[PDB]
Ligand binder design. Structure first.
Ligand SMILES: COc1ccc(Cl)cc1C(=O)NCCc1ccc(S(=O)(=O)NC(=O)NC2CCCCC2)cc1
Ligand SMILES: Nc1ncnc2c1ncn2[C@@H]1O[C@H](COP(=O)(O)OP(=O)(O)OP(=O)(O)O)[C@@H](O)[C@H]1O
Lengths: 96, 366, 48, 285, 470
């Protein structure tokens, strides 16, 4: 990602450096690069580990006792709403 | 879990468009607007810090009378069920104590006895029977396979108490239903106002005009029109009158404030010296802190209830230079009006000077 | 949710109240320390 | 473990929304990278003799009608020395751009040395000419090598002369080695030193077909640097089609220019052209 | 930290080569580290409780193999501490290389114009690429160690479980019991969660103690006071034998002042020895030892009770809007602001900038040059009404002497319409107009701020020669 970004920024039109802030290029080249280098890998690993553990757990629970999956529909419904609403608000709060 | 432990990145670089774009205004007005009363009634003032007077249970009853029809049935039903249940429990306890349950169970396990000469309240044997006996006593059904013998006076006390309380409940609920049935014409108010206001030229001076109409096939009696201007002023000696409401005449053939409301109308208001609209010009009347209120009063002959209808105008909505299209038109055999041309306005020759000068420079030409 | 709807802070957790308490507590330490010959005032025991 | 999922999902949303910025930026594709595949790469050994103005020179340094040509041409035989007269049309934006086909070589025909420059790769076209504008301010570190990346002969073998192209070091004993140039600093004399570096690069490069932009300090030192440049680079045949704040370079201009707000005509004769026509520019001071 | 920052000394002994970086760090990191320790405070004295209880209700559930299991699991902490330390060292090296790459990137991106024209982008990109290769060769170790951390933290518990259960059949005599095995697995999860957080807590806490040290190194610092609490026509006076700066060595010593209103006394002396110092000291931010301190109004005074504006030899522009810059605490008044903008001839400068008075200025924005910054400083100067105005080397590095003439006309036009005494200082004596006083010195005061007429023929001709010959 970084090599492609750096080899495609420099070979640029004059209008690109003209019409944009002389900080936005640098900001999205430093802060974003650091985030996607040393902060994104762990986030992806954590998400994958947690969701796989949860899925396997709910699978074995469902396999053991059938009545759980009859209760799955309500709980799952609940999950969706939570998994929706947080994600809408949290970002805004973080952006503050 | 501890998202940002690595706190080291700080003040490395941000240096960006946050406000230093220089081609976009940094400021965000956000455009909040405050009017004296909302466009659709609902005077929006702010009372606060008022010495409160507490509450009293008569207010709770007052709420009981004013309910939507889908809640009166619910409170009715709940009241009835709770009363029947409560007295059923009282009767069940009475039956338990006096030794009636045991007597009936023991002499009905073996049918040899057939004895009902010494019982407090005949043929009450379970809570089911008690909750069917209480039904037979409250609603005045009285099925009567369950008499009350005369002996145990506690039962008689319970009967007197329950009959009287049941009558109270019946009377109050009947009263609520009748009161809500009598005041049933009183749906709401449906007075339709034009939204946009013109300042045309007519009869040698300017104007101030809008349109108003009804929908109910009953016209409104002794209708009165009042027009006021809301602005902050001070005395020449300098005192802050926070939101001075000034009354201004609405023109009429004899200078009286009644109007007869059957086909929609123009409500003129000639600008003259005393009027606060003496000093407002064309390019001026987009920037001003003013609010013109209109107050319509009358009675509806059907329901016999006095009604007051409110609306509000600001200088921003008012569009100089227009007038109202003649909504009426002589049809094939009978007059008619299309309310679809309500907010429609057209433009015609409009002087751009101020009425302050429309007599100062005495040429009807501007 | 722009800054207009996040509100000004609650009455007791604003800047001034906290400033005042930390300063008072630190003095309550500095006055004790001044009589003490060879001990300086610090932050940790003052925060308690 | 059912709580980490939502939080980490929000974090992933924020981070991917961040990466969207780089993915969007990378889509920029312009300042066309190409060459017209000429044999011998449009000889750069050739582009050291003469130059001609482009007739109907229509630069594309805008989205609407450019100030280079509203059907505007120039009347130049080869070797037509020029000067500066105007505000924006006669300046270092369109004129300098089409000088060496570096900024918007689209229309007109600026055929450097007779050959169509517009059909040239950026490398050869930009490296067959040296241009310096105001203060360069584009280097970090030491000045020993920063002057050129592949100059083996004309700099090391002429060591005092390489710095002496405009102004010899004379403080190279105090600094370690040939140079240890400060981090974007020493700007006082560096105002002239940027031009000095351009002159050194364009004298080492053995091209000498360059137009050099204005100075800005207007101090005596800028005058001395301009005089030295004229003595060394502009004394040689190909000289500057310059623009400047002070009108002191019209000494040997042959056809002045009035590229401005109105007409794009730049027509001037052989002798009195510098004076009579420039009454506005000569009366500005 | 802020309220202690405001009342700090500007002497060169304390505020010096490392004064703004240390303060910035002490405000941006150490305060944050103390906060994030107080956030994780209780886990310090709760994790031990949980671990002890875990060992207890593991022994009473799985026999004497549970002690072995607890010893197995506990080893999660030392491994995590070691991994964290190595990770931190790797992170420091990576951060250094990242800063280097960022400096190079800003140098090759901001200077794009020359790079665009001379086409030197294809050759100087290899340097950034090589630095990126260095960055990857420094980050690989960080990624490897963090992967080792993730693997060990997820896996050590299962090995501990394996040992604790296996140990029983081969060694213990409990035969078979499915229910007992299930209980052990559940109690294990709780212990595992509590361990890793505790190792991380000890490391953040170690940073906290270190940070606190810095915090109580700052809040004890050199400050000017014990005089800042003390609240005819000439408003400046002294009977001093010394008002110096550092440790002894009386610097602005053996002087005296008299500055009546309406004057324009330009402190002009040997260029190189304390003009800035005397002027700054009268403002009251130097180590007053053996002087007579006086700045008391006439008919109104508390510490001169009025703000003497300034723009010292290093002009400073607030990192805010240009309008706020000019106002610097001034309610909007278009007359004064327009007159000051015209009097510095800032209209062409404002127009050629991005957006005039709407655009941000200074660092963290579209920048200016030295002459522009000088102009901004003098703009902040002229707009400060209701004051005994002043300045110090405002135009010394300014654009031109023509701008000096324009500013002279503006200074006469605006300030003199009021009665604001303006006391500049410069070695440029040519603009010696309106000398209602003149203070001179040679590493210490020379003569009084009298009229030019009395100075020029006070039987002191060397003064006239020195001032005019410039
Ligand atoms: C969650 O830890 C533990 C897990 C297990 C155990 Cl046995 C103990 C702990 C523990 O002792 N934890 C410390 C207390 C704690 C917990 C969660 C969180 S948090 O809400 O997840 N993170 C944030 O709030 N960050 C914001 C960012 C913006 C500024 C303000 C802070 C923050 C602090
Ligand atoms: N045919 C109608 N029926 C009900 N209300 C109407 C009608 N015509 C106008 N009004 C009233 O006029 C007010 C102004 O509404 P609005 O500006 O949206 O429409 P308009 O331009 O007045 O009329 P139209 O919608 O016919 O163009 C509204 O409060 C609306 O209730």
């Amino acid at each position: 990602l970084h090599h492609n970004l750096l080899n495609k920024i420099i070979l640029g039109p004059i209008r690109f450096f003209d019409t944009t802030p002389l900080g936005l290029i640098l900001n999205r080249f430093s802060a974003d690069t650091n985030i996607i280098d040393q902060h994104i890998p762990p986030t992806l690993e954590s998400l994958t580990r947690s969701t796989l553990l949860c899925l396997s757990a709910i699978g074995m629970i469902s396999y053991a006792t059938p009545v759980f999956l009859i209760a799955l529909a309500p709980l799952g419904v609940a999950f969706y709403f939570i998994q929706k609403y947080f994600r809408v608000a949290s970002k805004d709060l973080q952006e503050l | 879990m501890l998202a940002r432990k690595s706190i080291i990145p700080e003040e490395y670089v941000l240096a960006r468009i946050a406000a230093e774009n220089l081609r976009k205004p940094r400021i965000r007005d956000r455009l909040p607007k405050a009017r004296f009363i909302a466009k659709s009634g609902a005077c929006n003032l702010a009372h606060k810090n008022i010495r409160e007077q507490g509450r009293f249970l008569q207010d709770i009853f007052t709420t009981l009378v004013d309910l939507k029809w889908r809640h009166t049935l619910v409170i009715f039903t709940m009241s009835f069920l709770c009363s029947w249940l409560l007295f059923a429990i009282m009767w069940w306890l009475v039956a338990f104590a006096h030794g009636d349950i045991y007597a009936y169970m023991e002499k009905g396990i073996t049918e040899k006895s057939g004895l009902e000469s010494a019982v407090c309240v005949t043929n009450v044997r379970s809570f089911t029977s008690a909750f069917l006996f209480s039904i037979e006593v409250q609603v005045t059904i009285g099925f009567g396979g369950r008499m009350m013998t005369e002996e145990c006076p506690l039962a008689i006390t319970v009967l007197i108490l329950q009959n009287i309380v049941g009558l109270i409940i019946n009377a109050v609920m009947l009263g609520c239903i009748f009161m809500k049935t009598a005041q049933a014409h009183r749906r709401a108010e449906t007075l339709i106002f034009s939204r946009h206001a013109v300042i045309a030229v007519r009869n040698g001076k300017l104007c101030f005009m809008f349109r108003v109409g009804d929908l109910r096939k009953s016209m409104i009696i002794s209708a009165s029109v009042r027009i006021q201007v809301v602005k902050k002023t001070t005395t020449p000696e300098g005192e802050v009158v926070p939101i001075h409401q000034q009354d201004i005449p609405v023109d009429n053939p004899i200078e009286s404030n009644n109007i007869f409301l059957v086909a929609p109308l123009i409500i003129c208001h000639v600008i003259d010296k005393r009027s606060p609209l003496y000093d407002i010009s064309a390019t001026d009347l987009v920037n001003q802190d003013l609010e013109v209120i209109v107050i319509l009063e009358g009675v509806v002959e059907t329901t016999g209830i006095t009604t007051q209808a409110r609306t509000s105008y600001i200088a921003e909505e008012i569009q100089w230079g227009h007038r109202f299209v003649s909504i009426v038109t002589e049809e094939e055999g009978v007059y008619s009006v299309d309310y679809s041309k309500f907010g429609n306005t057209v433009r015609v020759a409009a002087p751009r000077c101020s009425a302050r000068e429309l007599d100062e420079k005495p040429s009807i030409l501007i | 949710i722009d800054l207009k709807a996040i509100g000004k802070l609650p009455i007791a957790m604003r800047a001034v109240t906290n400033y005042v308490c930390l300063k008072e507590a630190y003095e309550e330490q500095k006055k004790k320390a001044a009589d003490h010959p060879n001990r300086t005032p610090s932050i940790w025991l003052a925060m308690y | 473990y059912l709580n980490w999922v939502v939080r980490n999902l929000a974090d992933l949303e924020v981070q991917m929304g961040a990466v969207k910025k780089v993915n969007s930026f990378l889509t920029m594709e312009s300042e066309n990278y190409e060459g017209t595949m000429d044999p011998s790469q449009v000889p750069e050994h050739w582009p050291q003799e003469g130059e001609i103005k482009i007739h109907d020179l229509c630069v594309r340094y805008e989205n609407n009608l450019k100030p280079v040509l509203k059907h505007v041409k120039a009347y130049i035989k080869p070797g037509q020395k020029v000067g500066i007269c105007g505000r924006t049309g006669s300046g270092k934006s369109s004129l300098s751009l089409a000088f060496f086909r570096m900024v918007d070589i689209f229309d007109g025909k600026i055929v450097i040395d007779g050959i169509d420059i517009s059909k040239l790769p950026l490398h050869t076209l930009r490296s067959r000419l040296s241009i310096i504008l105001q203060d360069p301010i584009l280097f970090s570190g030491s000045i020993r090598f920063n002057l050129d990346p592949e100059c083996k002969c004309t700099d090391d073998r002429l060591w005092e002369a390489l710095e002496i192209a405009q102004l010899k070091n004379m403080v190279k004993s105090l600094p370690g080695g040939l140079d240890a140039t400060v981090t974007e600093g020493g700007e006082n004399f560096s105002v002239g030193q940027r031009q000095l570096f351009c002159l050194a690069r364009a004298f080492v490069r053995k091209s000498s077909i360059l137009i050099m932009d204005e100075a800005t300090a207007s101090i005596d030192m800028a005058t001395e640097n301009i005089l030295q440049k004229v003595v060394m680079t502009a004394f040689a045949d190909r000289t500057v089609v310059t623009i400047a704040h002070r009108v002191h370079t019209i000494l040997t201009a042959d056809l002045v220019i009035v590229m401005k707000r109105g007409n794009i005509l730049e027509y001037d004769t052989p002798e009195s052209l510098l004076a009579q026509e420039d009454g506005v520019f000569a009366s500005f001071v | 930290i802020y309220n202690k920052i405001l009342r700090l000394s500007t002497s060169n002994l304390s505020m010096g080569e490392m004064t703004l970086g240390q303060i910035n760090n002490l405000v941006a990191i150490e305060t944050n580290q103390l906060m994030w320790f107080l956030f994780l405070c209780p886990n310090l004295w709760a994790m031990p409780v949980q671990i002890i209880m875990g060992v207890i209700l593991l022994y009473n559930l799985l026999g004497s193999s549970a002690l072995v299991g607890a010893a197995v699991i506990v080893l999660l902490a030392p491994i995590q501490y070691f991994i964290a330390t190595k990770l931190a060292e790797a992170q420091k090296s990576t951060l250094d290389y990242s800063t280097e790459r960022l400096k190079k990137t800003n140098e090759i991106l901001k200077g794009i114009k020359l790079l665009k024209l001379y086409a030197w982008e294809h050759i100087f990109c290899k340097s950034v690429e090589e630095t990126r290769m260095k960055e990857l060769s420094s980050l690989k170790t960080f990624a490897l160690y963090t992967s080792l951390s993730i693997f060990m933290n997820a896996a050590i518990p299962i090995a501990a479980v394996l040992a604790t259960f296996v140990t029983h059949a081969y060694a213990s005599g409990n035969n078979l019991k499915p229910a007992e095995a299930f209980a052990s697995l559940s109690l294990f999860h709780i212990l595992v969660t509590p361990l890793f957080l505790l190792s991380t807590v000890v490391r953040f806490a170690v940073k906290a103690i270190i940070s606190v040290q810095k915090l109580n190194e700052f809040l004890l610092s050199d400050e000017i006071g014990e005089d800042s609490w003390r609240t005819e026509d000439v408003a400046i006076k002294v009977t001093n034998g010394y008002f110096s700066w550092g440790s002894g060595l009386a610097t602005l010593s053996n002087i005296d002042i008299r500055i009546p209103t309406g004057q324009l006394t330009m402190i002009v002396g040997q260029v190189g020895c304390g003009k800035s110092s005397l002027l700054l000291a009268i403002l009251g931010e130097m180590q007053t030892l053996e002087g007579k301190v006086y700045w008391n109004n006439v008919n109104e005074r508390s510490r001169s009770r009025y703000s003497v504006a300034y723009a010292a030899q290093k002009p400073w522009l607030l990192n805010a809007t240009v309008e706020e810059n000019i106002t610097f605490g001034s309610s909007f008044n278009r007359q004064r602001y327009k007159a000051v903008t015209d009097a510095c001839s800032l209209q062409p400068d404002i127009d050629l900038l991005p957006f005039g008075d709407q655009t941000e200025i200074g660092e963290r924005g579209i920048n200016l040059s030295g002459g522009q910054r000088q102009r901004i400083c003098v703009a902040r100067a002229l707009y400060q009404n209701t004051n005994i105005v002043f300045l110090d080397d405002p135009f010394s590095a300014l654009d031109i002497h023509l701008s000096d003439h324009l500013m002279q006309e503006g200074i006469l036009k605006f300030l003199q319409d009021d009665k604001r005494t303006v006391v500049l200082v410069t070695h440029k004596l040519q603009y010696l107009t309106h000398a209602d006083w003149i203070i001179a010195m040679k590493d210490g005061s020379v003569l009084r701020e009298g009229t030019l007429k009395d100075i020029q023929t006070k039987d002191v001709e060397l003064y006239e020669h020195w001032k005019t010959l410039m």
